[PDB]
Design a binder for this molecule. Sequence first.
Ligand SMILES: Nc1nc2c(ncn2[C@@H]2O[C@H](COP(=O)(O)OP(=O)(O)O)[C@@H](O)[C@H]2O)c(=O)[nH]1
Ligand SMILES: [Mg+2]
Ligand SMILES: [Mg+2]
Length: 164
Amino acid sequence: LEVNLAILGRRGAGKSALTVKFLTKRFISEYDPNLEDTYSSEETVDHQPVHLRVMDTADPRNCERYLNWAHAFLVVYSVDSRQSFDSSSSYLELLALHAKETQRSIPALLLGNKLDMAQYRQVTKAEGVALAGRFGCLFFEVSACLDFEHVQHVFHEAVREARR
Ligand SMILES: Nc1nc2c(ncn2[C@@H]2O[C@H](COP(=O)(O)OP(=O)(O)O)[C@@H](O)[C@H]2O)c(=O)[nH]1
Ligand SMILES: [Mg+2]
Ligand SMILES: [Mg+2]
């Protein structure tokens, strides 16, 4: 089973850090901000094997490259950046519009990353919940430089959302 996951969000939000942590179980803090690519991994989600494809985007034009490809989305902002949070809402609007225009119904997970920087929070967890509420998507706060298991969970949950 092949599952396409696309990761969207404003530059700086930690899209690649989250991807590399998922893939490698390590935090890599400087990763080419311009590099966009699809990363392949063999996963097991609910005792079921998956060929997972993770598209780590770097933005704007030809959004269909992910809009007509992904089976689920992660939309990422940083909890220490209002700017990032605001940009996250635009990606969710795009997902909504595309679904409306094409009938393509794809689940999304809203991610407030850099939970390790919670002391400099510009966005509350309650506000992330509210934003997810406006788009009917799931919501998680995560970090690329805490443990691996919580990052694995969100990626595997996108898989579960894609299978439902
Ligand atoms: N403190 C902290 N910094 C992070 C985290 N994730 C990414 N970063 C940093 O945020 C910046 C952008 O990360 P990057 O993965 O390039 O984000 P991208 O542009 O969305 O792909 C870099 O300085 C990363 O080191 C995180 O979870 N916690
Ligand atoms: Mg990146
Ligand atoms: Mg490639």
